[PDB]
């Protein structure tokens, strides 16, 4: 019972089965960036106010 | 070489040709030194008679 799952684990008895642990993590990288020549074709329109 | 099928005509073109060794001794050896990857995962499959 999940009440019994306290006392087995709140004392340190191995509760008959095991587990696996999943965490998420985050890094902030650095990124280099090559390109070809005609990598885009860019359009400048018209300003307005 | 022509052949008329559905749609339209379909021209096929082939040029017959041949070769020869033209070398009394050995010519053109071929070494084998780099590997990309195994094609198979090297095993663990039963055989079923």
């Amino acid at each position: 019972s999940p009440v019994a799952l306290y006392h087995q684990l709140k004392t340190g008895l191995h509760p008959g089965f095991g587990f696996t642990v999943v965490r998420q993590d985050r890094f902030v990288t650095e990124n280099v960036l090559f390109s070809e020549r005609a990598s885009e074709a860019y359009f400048l329109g018209q300003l307005q106010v | 070489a022509r052949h008329e099928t559905g749609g339209g005509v379909n021209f096929t073109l082939t040029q017959p040709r041949g070769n020869v060794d033209l070398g009394v001794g050995y010519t053109a050896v071929a070494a084998t030194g780099t590997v990309r990857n195994p094609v198979t995962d090297m095993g663990n499959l039963p055989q079923n008679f």
Binding site: G16, G18, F19, T20, V22, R23 | -
Partner: protein
Amino acid sequence: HGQDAVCEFIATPVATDINYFRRPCNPRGRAAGGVYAGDKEGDVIALMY
């Protein structure tokens, strides 16, 4: 130290070998990637389950 990670637990059997770990694997024990399929329209979830 920074932002906290969150560990979640999944009930696993004790005699599921460590050889399945020390290797990049799913936490579920079975591969589940849709990229592993081959476009059969049933190689979705019936791959996973």
